[PDB]
Amino acid sequence: IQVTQSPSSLSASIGDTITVACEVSQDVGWAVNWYHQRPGRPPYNLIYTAHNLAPGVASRFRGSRVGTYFTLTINNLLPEDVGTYYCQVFDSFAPGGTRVDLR
Amino acid sequence: NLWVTVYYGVPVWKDAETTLFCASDKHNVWATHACVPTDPNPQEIHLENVTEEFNMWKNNMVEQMHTDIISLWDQSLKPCVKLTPLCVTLQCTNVTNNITDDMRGELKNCSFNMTTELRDKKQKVYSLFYRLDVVQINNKEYRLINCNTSAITQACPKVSFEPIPIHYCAPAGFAILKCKDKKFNGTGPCPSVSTVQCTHGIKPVVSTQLLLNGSLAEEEVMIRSENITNNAKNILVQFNTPVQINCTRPNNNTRKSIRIGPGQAFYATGDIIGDIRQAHCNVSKATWNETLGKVVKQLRKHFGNNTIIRFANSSGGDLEVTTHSFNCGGEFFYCNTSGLFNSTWISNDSITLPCRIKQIINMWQRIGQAMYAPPIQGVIRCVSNITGLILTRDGGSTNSTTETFRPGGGDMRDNWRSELYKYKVVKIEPLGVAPTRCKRR
Amino acid sequence: NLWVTVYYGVPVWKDAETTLFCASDKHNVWATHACVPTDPNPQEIHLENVTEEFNMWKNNMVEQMHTDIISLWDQSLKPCVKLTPLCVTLQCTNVTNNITDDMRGELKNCSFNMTTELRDKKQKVYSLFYRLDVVQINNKEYRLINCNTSAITQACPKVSFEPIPIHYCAPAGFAILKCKDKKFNGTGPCPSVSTVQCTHGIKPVVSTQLLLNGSLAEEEVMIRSENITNNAKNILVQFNTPVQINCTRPNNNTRKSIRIGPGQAFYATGDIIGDIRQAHCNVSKATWNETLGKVVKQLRKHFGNNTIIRFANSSGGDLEVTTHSFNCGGEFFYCNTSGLFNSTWISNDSITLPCRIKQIINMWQRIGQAMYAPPIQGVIRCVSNITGLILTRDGGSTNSTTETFRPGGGDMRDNWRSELYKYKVVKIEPLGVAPTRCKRR
Amino acid sequence: FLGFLGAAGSTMGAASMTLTVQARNLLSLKLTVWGIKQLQARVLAVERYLRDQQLLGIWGCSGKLICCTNVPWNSSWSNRNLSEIWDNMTWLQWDKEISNYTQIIYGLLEESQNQQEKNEQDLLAL
Amino acid sequence: FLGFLGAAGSTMGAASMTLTVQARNLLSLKLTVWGIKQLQARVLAVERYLRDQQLLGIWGCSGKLICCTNVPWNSSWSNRNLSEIWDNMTWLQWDKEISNYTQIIYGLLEESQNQQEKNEQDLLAL
Amino acid sequence: FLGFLGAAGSTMGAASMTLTVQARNLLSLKLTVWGIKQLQARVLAVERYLRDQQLLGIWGCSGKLICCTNVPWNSSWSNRNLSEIWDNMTWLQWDKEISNYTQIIYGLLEESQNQQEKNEQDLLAL
């Protein structure tokens, strides 16, 4: 199953609310786990089941499901959130991911 | 005007989890003698107008029965001899008399010092161990493969590993719902629900790739999987017709009893009378081809008509998963099923599967304890039915329609769930309240 | 006009089988402390007008309590030292210092290498073993008799084998029927039946030929045997008067503790202080003759007045049967008892029975496990009551009226059926339907 | 007073006069053999009592030692005269000679109770 | 006759006509795995039956399969017409759509039974 | 509402007003120490409830929290005035000062219930 992400990159200032989309080609239920990778650091779990927060993740992260349209919403952006965001469905990873950097 | 009236014994049930006791119709590893004697005539009641949701995966019965089988397996070895003295340096020489081309090095003639009845006295004896049980130490010096990871207790030779059908009966106040739909894929509503006091004959067969002696589908070969899209959940296949499989151990094995202590006997493997050949399982080529044709015809539906379906052998892993392992008359086989899953499909003869024997068996992958299956005297041979498949799909490149399916298994819950698939456990709730024109006095 | 009227609590019972719990009035082998404390005043109720069928031979209670005794005997052995290191080569010499003529060769002064607290360090120690416990290997080399066919576990020295009376009590809804008839011939109807909450004091005495400490017949010696014409069914003899038997072991034995490992102690037999004599039992000649006269008088009824009754000793067999074996203060005896069944009958003095003692005891003939009775310090003396016999008749030619009876036993169920002979287990069914002139409003 | 099963050999009427004494005796640690046997006996007793109590409850006779019903007695079961039954017979023989017809009697009892209760509800509602 | 849960899909009236067959099936060795599972199942069944019987007893309806009482229908639990309920509805959907309000109904039953019993005492003594 | 044993120290009438809340709490894995303790506790609770239910049933008072009988008060057990008992005393003291006369009262209740039922039989028959 092909999985797509958009936008490829985005810049937001401190404290803004931003969202990232992850579109799936077929019905995947809610199995769209999210992962964030800080530059030069191994990726770690953000959201599992597409709406459940991983342990240690602040409540400021939120995920939701609109049919086959999936969103990860970020509130009150903070500097440590800079990096890349990946959404996983089964064995498929979105090509390129989404890069988030400070404005 | 209106008032409420309390009812007793209303036909109302809720999904619930409870303990199920066994009933069954020589000692056995599964304590069938401990099962209550089932009624000669089971009672089955058809529930017309009823539509109940079913789900093998979220069913408790599979987990409960996995626990039950593991408990029985553990209990059957407690009053059995512990082979701790066998962990001694071995002197093994290859057996090379009257052996065939494929028997070069599969059996080892190991001689070792062993404790006799008298503690101070010792004794030198010899035994025949298959190559998979002994590992070289770096004639040469060998040891049992268990010796650095676990301690084995010899399976008591008098208990039979043969599967006896056992029925799991819910206590009073609970009911078992049996889905009568012949096209029921295992998830979603089952329009035809019939209740029974408890299950039909369930044989807890122990197999990995091919499901032996199982229950057949009534109409067509069916494909059952939690999320077919997810290329990880095993695809449970159930055959509408049986595929007979024959296989035997041609060696005329002899059981030699070696006393290793007070009342403790270790049953070794003596010299084989006659030539030594390969254990090999036979499957009819035409019957297997027809069954594969039916399977691929029913599989195309879930995917597409124009897609290419190709069966390849197991990718890799431990011996149990890579091969087709199953106990046959007290012996544990490991059959190299590469000639079965080999064809590629586009929109009298028998297949010989070379099997390998193992005596040090570690089922359930328990940390610290393993089993030594005593050798079976004579030539063992069993005729079983291939009644299912456990296929694992491989993720494609999203560019080709060549869906590749390989045998899986290992997780015995998958093997067992093809038998408890049509059943469900419900809790009777006989108190009901409804409005009626009645009034208390 | 008539109608049915339901009734609750009617006195109706059916023959049935059920589990009976223990009740009884230092730790002991039978765990009588685990038995519920019985009522100080038993509730015994006389059921006249009632005639109930009885049959000891097909009574469940004998089988159930035999199973209970075996389970208790096994369970009292689990938390006890396992004597596996004792199965080591022995160097035994004759004990010929201060011994009598009959004691020549019965003791063996065995010295052996034994492991000590420190595993690497070994140790040499000596102990005394009776000739029946050690077998020669072909001073000479010996081994414990059951070190090539069973594992030896020492009975814990602080638990006593003395029989504490136990009462078998049925649960609620069940009743125990007691046949008060003093002439109950062992089967058929019992005209005088009475119910009790549960049984009187039953002592699970262990004996083979003569019944010790049993319950006396109230009026006269009774002969009870299913199919008395069958010359293979044991004949249960019950005495109306007790025959006192005095059993003693004159040796003043010393218990020497030998530590064979961490917290594990093997209690050996040290040197005997003073002269070594033969353990023996004493039976009054006149009393035994009178009891035999009563028995033969009561036995002529089932065979005729003119027949000749002759008592010979027990024929060949294992030691436990050929001899009158029992326990006496923690020690197991094996008494000759050929002077008892010695005479023939036609239409101050004591009889000394030379007994032999054994330490390796295998009761219930379990395969793989044997018991080592620890020696008892001091001189042991027992005063028991001969209250029954196990006589096995022998067939003969049609031209002979000389019916020969020999002591039997072995099957402990025969030993115990003489105590549960007058009891029966019934199931109360309190629901009854009767025709009355009443019709529900 | 005679005690538990005291009137076992008595006549029908005398036995029925003292149903309570037999009625009161249907109901009255580690994993040791004696302990497990005690527990099994306890559970068996309680289950037997509740089976009997439930069976009474179905016929609408719970709490009543002697309860009447509304099913006729077919003479096929027993045509004996009442005087002979209640003055020259014990409960043992009575259960002996009706062991086979018990189930159909129980079914008739159950059906009659259900129908009578439904009629009572209909009258109470109207 | 259909058997245990025979009229599960049938209408309300037909199901109520045969309450007994489901009512009568609500109640009907060493320490081995199957033995302990059997004992636990037996105890679970007996306790479930006793809890159900106790709940029936509190509302003053012990021994009665169909029992009515003296608490009104709040009409917020369900406002469906009687004919539709008892002719075109099964017990399954009924319990499905009334499950949340069960506790308050049970409490009302409890209070009504207690007050009625106290009034019966008061009028009985006078 | 106060809860389980809420009116333990309350007067007789207030305690009698709320019997139901103590009435409901009278009834509500491997061979591990905790498991066996749980199982024994469960069985003990079941039997403790059933003994009380049986005692109520024998007196013809099953299913009734308050039940009146036909046993006269001997006045030797307690001659205290009704107003004093039912307005200035707690159940604990009441049970304290009749701990010895309980058995004879139970026997009188049993015999009175039995005779009463058989009397009813005669009238229902005639």
Ligand SMILES: *[C@@H]1O[C@H](CO)[C@@H](O[C@@H]2O[C@H](CO)[C@@H](O[C@@H]3O[C@H](CO)[C@@H](O)[C@H](O)[C@@H]3O)[C@H](O)[C@H]2NC(C)=O)[C@H](O)[C@H]1NC(C)=O
């Ligand atoms: C699937 O079911 C078939 C049919 O029950 C099983 O075949 C049976 O396998 C047992 C294994 O020992 C055979 O028992 C042997 O029978 C010979 C007959 O003389 C006896 O001498 C041996 O001592 C042993 O008892 C049995 O004959 C064979 N066939 C039948 C009809 O029972 C098969 O084993 C089952 N599949 C698996 C994987 O176990």
Ligand SMILES: *[C@@H]1O[C@H](CO)[C@@H](O[C@@H]2O[C@H](CO)[C@@H](O[C@@H]3O[C@H](CO)[C@@H](O)[C@H](O)[C@@H]3O)[C@H](O)[C@H]2NC(C)=O)[C@H](O)[C@H]1NC(C)=O
């Ligand atoms: C039959 O029953 C009699 C009496 O019930 C048994 O005799 C008793 O035997 C026990 C030991 O076997 C004696 O207890 C021991 O006594 C000595 C000396 O007092 C003491 O040092 C020990 O520690 C132990 O307590 C008991 O005195 C004796 N009773 C007598 C002699 O009256 C007899 O053993 C039974 N027969 C059997 C079991 O075969």
Ligand SMILES: *[C@@H]1O[C@H](CO)[C@@H](O[C@@H]2O[C@H](CO)[C@@H](O)[C@H](O)[C@H]2NC(C)=O)[C@H](O)[C@H]1NC(C)=O
């Ligand atoms: C194994 O398969 C054979 C058939 O190859 C089964 O034998 C009979 O098969 C026919 C065909 O449907 C059935 O109608 C019979 O009922 C089968 N015999 C019996 C005794 O059931 C055989 O039963 C199968 N063994 C299994 C499933 O264990």
Ligand SMILES: *[C@@H]1O[C@H](CO)[C@@H](O[C@@H]2O[C@H](CO)[C@@H](O)[C@H](O)[C@H]2NC(C)=O)[C@H](O)[C@H]1NC(C)=O
């Ligand atoms: C794939 O698997 C997921 C596993 O959860 C399925 O998702 C659930 O589907 C059920 C269907 O009744 C819903 O009730 C759940 O709420 C879903 N939850 C989650 C976590 O997704 C999904 O339906 C499956 N779908 C496919 C395409 O196989």
Ligand SMILES: *[C@@H]1O[C@H](CO)[C@@H](O[C@@H]2O[C@H](CO)[C@@H](O)[C@H](O)[C@H]2NC(C)=O)[C@H](O)[C@H]1NC(C)=O
């Ligand atoms: C499995 O099938 C093979 C052949 O497909 C069998 O092997 C032959 O067995 C016969 C005796 O039955 C021999 O004469 C032949 O030499 C064997 N080899 C060949 C190539 O034919 C084998 O016996 C079968 N095993 C079974 C039925 O258990």
Ligand SMILES: *[C@@H]1O[C@H](CO)[C@@H](O[C@@H]2O[C@H](CO)[C@@H](O)[C@H](O)[C@H]2NC(C)=O)[C@H](O)[C@H]1NC(C)=O
């Ligand atoms: C497996 O073995 C069975 C016999 O144990 C084979 O059945 C035999 O088949 C031949 C040829 O069709 C018949 O002549 C025999 O009468 C059959 N014997 C029976 C039914 O007992 C079966 O063909 C074998 N299967 C394979 C794949 O080798």
Ligand SMILES: *[C@@H]1O[C@H](CO)[C@@H](O[C@@H]2O[C@H](CO)[C@@H](O)[C@H](O)[C@H]2NC(C)=O)[C@H](O)[C@H]1NC(C)=O
């Ligand atoms: C699946 O089949 C392939 C080829 O049919 C097997 O690959 C062979 O593996 C052996 C090792 O045991 C090599 O010696 C061969 O050279 C391989 N052949 C190839 C790569 O063409 C593979 O082992 C099989 N896997 C199984 C049976 O689990």
Ligand SMILES: *[C@@H]1O[C@H](CO)[C@@H](O[C@@H]2O[C@H](CO)[C@@H](O)[C@H](O)[C@H]2NC(C)=O)[C@H](O)[C@H]1NC(C)=O
């Ligand atoms: C299982 O079967 C396959 C196919 O028969 C075996 O693969 C062959 O292995 C031999 C050497 O063992 C090679 O010479 C062949 O080239 C391989 N391929 C074929 C098609 O024969 C495999 O070795 C067997 N055993 C295992 C453990 O996989």
Ligand SMILES: *[C@@H]1O[C@H](CO)[C@@H](O[C@@H]2O[C@H](CO)[C@@H](O)[C@H](O)[C@H]2NC(C)=O)[C@H](O)[C@H]1NC(C)=O
């Ligand atoms: C059994 O009786 C014998 C005699 O029949 C007793 O033997 C005597 O014992 C006394 C000691 O009390 C010695 O002084 C005698 O010399 C013995 N007489 C012999 C051996 O002929 C024996 O003590 C009795 N055993 C008992 C009572 O346990």
Ligand SMILES: *[C@@H]1O[C@H](CO)[C@@H](O[C@@H]2O[C@H](CO)[C@@H](O)[C@H](O)[C@H]2NC(C)=O)[C@H](O)[C@H]1NC(C)=O
């Ligand atoms: C068994 O021993 C007891 C006591 O040791 C003997 O009983 C004594 O018998 C003598 C007669 O020889 C009397 O004078 C004593 O008064 C008795 N004492 C007691 C306590 O009973 C008994 O006679 C011995 N029996 C045999 C057969 O040796």
Ligand SMILES: *[C@@H]1O[C@H](CO)[C@@H](O[C@@H]2O[C@H](CO)[C@@H](O)[C@H](O)[C@H]2NC(C)=O)[C@H](O)[C@H]1NC(C)=O
């Ligand atoms: C029963 O009595 C006979 C004869 O008194 C015993 O036979 C004796 O057996 C021994 C063996 O220990 C021989 O040494 C004797 O020669 C035999 N005497 C004979 C044949 O007259 C027989 O042993 C006695 N039974 C038992 C069990 O001891």
Ligand SMILES: *[C@@H]1O[C@H](CO)[C@@H](O[C@@H]2O[C@H](CO)[C@@H](O)[C@H](O)[C@H]2NC(C)=O)[C@H](O)[C@H]1NC(C)=O
């Ligand atoms: C049991 O006792 C009898 C008689 O007391 C023993 O038979 C005697 O044994 C001796 C020893 O060899 C012989 O000299 C006698 O001839 C035998 N007969 C008689 C009448 O004394 C018998 O051996 C004993 N059983 C044993 C010791 O096992």
Ligand SMILES: *[C@@H]1O[C@H](CO)[C@@H](O)[C@H](O)[C@H]1NC(C)=O
């Ligand atoms: C194994 O070796 C022993 C000698 O150690 C020999 O007696 C026996 O025949 C051998 N077995 C074979 C070669 O199969």
Ligand SMILES: *[C@@H]1O[C@H](CO)[C@@H](O)[C@H](O)[C@H]1NC(C)=O
């Ligand atoms: C013995 O068998 C081993 C395989 O386990 C092999 O490596 C070795 O070469 C063999 N030795 C012979 C045949 O002499």
Ligand SMILES: *[C@@H]1O[C@H](CO)[C@@H](O)[C@H](O)[C@H]1NC(C)=O
């Ligand atoms: C047994 O022990 C002896 C002692 O040296 C040794 O020579 C022999 O090789 C041993 N046998 C084995 C290890 O099989």
Ligand SMILES: *[C@@H]1O[C@H](CO)[C@@H](O)[C@H](O)[C@H]1NC(C)=O
């Ligand atoms: C046991 O030995 C094998 C080789 O004989 C080795 O591969 C394995 O890692 C060892 N396991 C241990 C040391 O736990």
